[PDB]
């Protein structure tokens, strides 16, 4: 029961059970369906909804060649980094948006889901890295990070740290440290004369 004139499965991404960790953010290509973004912008359940390069009303009458949906989980105080030209632990080492980002960013508090009583240690983030990430780069490598003069040889030691750290979400945390799920819609508009599309 599937056709090309069907509706895009936006539920699979937003209303998903588990979400990826930010350092290993999950990307889905939305393809071969009718994307109706009215289900999103007419919904008061999101706490952050900011598009860059496009008016959110113009989404339904534009022409896209590729549409990607990135999901992950971070802290509250880190949602401000899911935007072009930002810095911090998430923008430099985990998920970097380009300066010419043409898409949307949708965040919402999921403390009632991604926080367990003793601390949900399934959500991780990269803490150490040599160089910054490129835009949309993904580093799932768990190689020991060398913060000193002598090599580490894949062994946790003095000046030899494991690069991933856990959030440890508990419901008793402040909103700045509660888990926030983030969906990042990226677009690629096709080059055409205005007479064709716009």
């Amino acid at each position, epitope marked *: 029961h599937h056709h090309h004139t069907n509706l895009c499965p936006f539920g699979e991404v937003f209303n998903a059970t588990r979400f990826a960790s930010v350092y290993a953010w999950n990307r889905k290509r939305i393809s071969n369906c009718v994307a109706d973004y009215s289900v999103l912008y007419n919904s008061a359940s999101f706490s952050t909804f900011k598009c860059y390069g496009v008016s959110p009303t113009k989404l339904n009458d534009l022409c896209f060649t590729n549409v990607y949906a990135d999901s992950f989980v971070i802290r509250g*105080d880190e949602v*401000r980094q899911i935007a072009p030209g930002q*810095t911090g*632990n998430i923008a430099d080492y985990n998920y970097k948006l380009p300066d010419d980002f043409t898409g949307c960013v949708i965040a919402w508090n999921s403390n009632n889901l991604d926080s367990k009583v003793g*601390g949900n240690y399934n959500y991780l983030y990269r*803490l*150490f890295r040599k160089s*910054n990430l490129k835009p949309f780069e993904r580093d799932i490598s768990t190689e020991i990070y060398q*913060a000193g003069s002598t090599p580490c040889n894949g062994v946790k030691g*003095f*000046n030899c*740290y494991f690069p991933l*750290q*856990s*959030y*440890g979400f508990q419901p*008793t*945390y*402040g*909103v*700045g*440290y509660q888990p926030y799920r983030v969906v990042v819609l990226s677009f690629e508009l096709l080059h055409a004369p205005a007479t064709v599309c716009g």
Partner: antibody
Amino acid sequence: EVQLVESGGGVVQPGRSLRLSCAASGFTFSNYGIHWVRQAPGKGLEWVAVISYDGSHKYYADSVKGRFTISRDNSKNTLYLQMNSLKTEDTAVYYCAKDSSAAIPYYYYGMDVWGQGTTVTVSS
Amino acid sequence: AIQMTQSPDSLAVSLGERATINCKSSQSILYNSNNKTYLAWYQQKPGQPPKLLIFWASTRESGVPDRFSGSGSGTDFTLTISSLQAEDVAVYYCQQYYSIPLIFGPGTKVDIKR
């Protein structure tokens, strides 16, 4: 809803020892380094010590080097400061200052959360 | 040790006017391998602990009003309050965290100019 609570301050004779403690809540305490910053009455802020997010790196101020001993207990979400051979020049308020990311030489991101601060008086 | 110096020691300025605080370090706080100056700005009111306003010299901390801005690179730094409010009367410290020991400035007292 995050807070650091100092503890253990009081009056101490010169040369005697006293241990301060600072309890943290509302955030994953084992992910961030913590500092101790003291402030003499009516004088500027002075940095004291720091401990990394695991206890590996501990550095102290030149004015308290070898006299103070910083330590933490990530299982109980508590950090400690062990002061010995106290001077009247150590009389001050002692704040614990949470860092923004660990505490390896080049990973000091500044301190964003501070405690109310416990008071330490050293006088005969 | 990296010695921090602030000028002026006290700046009384009327409300809605701009307040400028400066901070000079004895050594360069700009790290070569990431182009980040390890300079911060703290605000301390009576009876209260300090409060982080600016880190990385120019990045404003989450929850700080837009009238607080930091500038400068290397050794000369400046915290600027574009339109001084009545609630901004406090003591402002700059602090370096490039190398150890971490060292604060002498502090600058800011009061309203009646």
